[PDB]
């Protein structure tokens, strides 16, 4: 019941012959998978910690200029020289100047002066790469027990840490058995082309090549005294005051400029180690050693009384909180959805098996009814509690929402979205293969095209398809226009 009020829960119904249902654990999301007889349980990856990462290189965002020194030679003589030109910490630019008898030189013409300056950085910005032998994913597995304090609670579950070295694991549950994960973390979010960069207690994940491309003076990265800065001319600016003499100016603080240069990069907490949020992981659930643990129990004769008003979630599932009345046994909770004058039931129990645990705490069930007027009967006797509800939506709206959600999943996760709820069907493999090929082509073509430029190119290609004599219109327009407009509309995230 940890995966109840999140608003991004997406149910995974059904499992294969070998019972290895699959899910793709999205960082903000949670799955709430279930089965025909297994205990329904919800899974959500939470933190994906990384640690013992090394510093690769250091960039400089604020500079100080000291010891400005200048020399000038007469015209028709070599470029002016300082003994300070060849020091590692000096930026020095030759230039020209006019001088004649007014400057004490006999021969008129353009002379050469140079202004060397010592450059020392004040606040570097480090870019630290993360390795693969230290990445540690952390997954909570909270099982729907209908416990008193399980709805919305974020501190209930059994941690199953999964590192790339020890990919597989088996999370032992309190009383429901064992659930095994064969998760594959190497195919998830790529941590090879992603380099962390940190400034002033802020850490971001940026593409590695982009981090090298950006124009700031860098250094070796290994910590030491006086890191000899390379490409340091980007900060120092050498203004020439209309050919009479030269001035040296330091550009200023680049913190704000970088805070704009990182517009599309995700952010991660950097308080202790690196709690890298904003990831995604795929995994398959063995889900064959689990036990319902409630089948042997009986059915409670005594009545049931609720404690909170019925309130459904954003996904149209009734949630019921009911406390058992006086009796001397734990049991199964009977349950049957009924219409006002129709006894056909179409409402399932998303909770596996509602069982009273300690006789004193309310056990809160969570079950979805069919859309329309349909009351709920819980107790076995004729004095049973009869909670009545009228579901608002319709099946067509649910289908539309499902299509939109699947479109979002395929637009975000890309190639691996076809394996989300995969039962192992052959058709899903073919779909994933063709989507992988088309997605590779699309990424190659559209890599780096911005949010507005995608929409522009999409509408342009849609018009080109529409006004075409050849029978490539029905392909180009539909496919490229729809795909590109959708990706432009939902690309920024």
């Amino acid at each position: 019941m940890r995966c109840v009020g999140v608003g991004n829960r997406d149910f995974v119904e059904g499992l294969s012959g070998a019972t290895w249902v699959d899910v793709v654990l999205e960082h903000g999301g949670c799955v709430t998978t279930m089965a025909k007889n297994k205990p329904t349980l919800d899974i959500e990856l939470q933190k994906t910690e990384a640690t013992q990462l090394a510093t690769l290189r250091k960039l400089c965002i604020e500079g100080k200029i000291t010891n400005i020194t200048t020399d000038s030679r007469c015209p028709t003589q070599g470029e002016a020289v300082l003994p300070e030109e060849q020091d590692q910490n000096y930026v020095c630019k030759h230039t020209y100047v006019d001088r004649g008898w007014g400057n004490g030189c006999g021969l008129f013409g353009k002379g050469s002066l140079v202004t060397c300056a010592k450059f020392q950085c004040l606040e570097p910005i480090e870019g630290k790469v993360v390795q693969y032998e230290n990445l540690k994913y952390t997954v909570i597995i909270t099982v729907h027990t209908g416990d008193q304090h399980q709805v919305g609670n974020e501190t209930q579950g059994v941690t199953a840490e999964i590192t790339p070295q020890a990919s597989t694991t088996e999370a032992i549950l309190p009383e429901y058995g064992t659930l095994g994960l064969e998760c594959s973390p190497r195919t998830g979010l790529d941590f090879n082309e992603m380099i962390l960069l940190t400034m002033k207690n802020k850490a971001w994940m940026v593409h590695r090549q982009w981090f090298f491309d950006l124009p700031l003076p860098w250094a070796s990265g290994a910590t030491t005294e006086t890191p000899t800065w390379n490409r340091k001319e980007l900060l120092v600016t050498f203004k020439n005051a209309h050919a009479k003499k030269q001035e040296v100016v330091v550009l200023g603080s680049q913190e704000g400029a970088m805070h704009t240069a990182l517009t599309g990069a995700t952010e991660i907490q950097n308080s202790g180690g690196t709690s890298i949020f904003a990831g995604h992981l795929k995994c398959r659930l063995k889900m064959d050693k689990l036990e319902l643990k409630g089948m042997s129990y009986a059915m409670c004769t005594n009545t049931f009384v609720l404690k909170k008003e019925v309130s459904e979630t954003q996904h149209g599932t009734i949630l019921i909180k009911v406390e058992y009345k006086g009796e001397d046994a734990p049991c199964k909770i009977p349950f049957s959805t009924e219409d006002g004058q129709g006894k056909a039931h179409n409402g399932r129990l998303i909770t596996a098996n509602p069982v009273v645990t300690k006789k004193e705490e309310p056990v809160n069930i969570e079950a979805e009814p069919p859309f329309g007027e349909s009351n709920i009967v819980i107790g076995i006797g004729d004095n049973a509690l009869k909670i009545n509800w009228y579901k608002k939506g319709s099946s067509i709206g649910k289908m539309f929402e499902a299509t939109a959600r699947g479109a979002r999943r395929m637009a975000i996760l890309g190639d691996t979205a076809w394996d989300f709820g995969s039962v192992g069907g052959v058709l899903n493999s073919l779909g994933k293969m063709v989507h992988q090929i088309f997605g590779s082509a699309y990424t190659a073509l559209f890599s780096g095209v911005s949010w507005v430029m995608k929409i522009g190119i999409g509408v342009l290609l849609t018009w080109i398809g529409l006004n075409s004599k050849n029978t490539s219109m029905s392909f180009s327009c539909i496919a490229i226009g729809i795909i590109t407009l959708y990706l432009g509309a939902v690309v920024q995230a």
């Epitope: 604020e62 100080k64 200029i65 000291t66 010891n67 400005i68 020194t69 200048t70 020392q120 950085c121 004040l122 606040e123 570097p124 005294e225 006086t226």
Partner: antibody
């Protein structure tokens, strides 16, 4: 946003040693050239010592030459001022100052610490 | 060592009036290589650690009210305070920064008349 805090000021008899620590925060401490400063009550500010960005360019004033030791530890973000052969004239409140972020001088004062007072008497 | 002399040792000005301080050096503070006069000015508020007002002479440090203005060149420099508030009481210290043994001037003071 810069924050400089002092520590080590206490009463002491003449001749005995004492070490003053300047803990700093809010900036990269290792890429700076810290100073020390002092002022006796009823008198003007008096310079004490400087340690450069490179740890091997220390300097001191004439009245305090050959009697004080200044040392930085980058990792612990503290500035150590080991003072020996202290006298009742040398007692004063000691200020720990930062370097000039914007400017041309390799040595200047942007920001002053809170200030600790060391009391010297018999 | 540079002898620093401040013309007033105590200024009593009524609010809304200008107060000017003259600090005359003993040798030239102009660094020949860059042609910049390296002078500094600090205000120590009552019972506070001093802050910085005028790095170099023309320039002015951030977080400083626009009223303060440095002037002068070649061993004789001058501040100006167009309007004096109750918060301008303190101990203005001119200091040279050209040569390594930094010497402050004797502390002047500014009290409201």
């Amino acid at each position: 946003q810069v924050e400089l805090v002092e520590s080590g000021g206490d009463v002491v008899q003449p001749g005995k040693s004492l070490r003053l620590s300047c803990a700093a925060s809010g900036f990269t401490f290792t890429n700076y050239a810290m100073h020390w400063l002092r002022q006796a009550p009823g008198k003007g500010l008096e310079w004490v010592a400087v340690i450069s960005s490179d740890v091997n360019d220390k300097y001191y004033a004439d009245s305090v030459k050959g009697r004080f030791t200044i040392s930085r530890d980058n990792s612990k973000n503290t500035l150590y001022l080991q003072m020996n052969s202290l006298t009742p004239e040398d007692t004063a409140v000691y200020y720990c100052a930062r370097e000039q972020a914007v400017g041309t001088n390799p040595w200047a004062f942007d920001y002053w610490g809170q200030g600790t007072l060391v009391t010297v008497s018999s | 060592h540079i002898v620093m002399t401040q013309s007033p040792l105590s200024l009593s000005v009524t609010p809304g009036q200008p107060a000017s301080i003259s600090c005359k050096s003993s040798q030239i503070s102009s660094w020949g290589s860059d042609g910049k006069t390296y002078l500094y000015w600090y205000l120590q508020k009552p019972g506070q650690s001093p802050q910085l007002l005028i790095y170099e002479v023309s320039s002015r440090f951030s977080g400083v009210s626009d009223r303060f203005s440095g002037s002068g060149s070649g061993t004789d420099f001058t501040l100006k305070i167009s309007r004096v508030q109750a918060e301008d009481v303190g101990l203005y210290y001119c200091m040279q920064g050209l040569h390594l043994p930094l010497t402050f001037g004797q502390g002047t003071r500014l009290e409201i008349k």
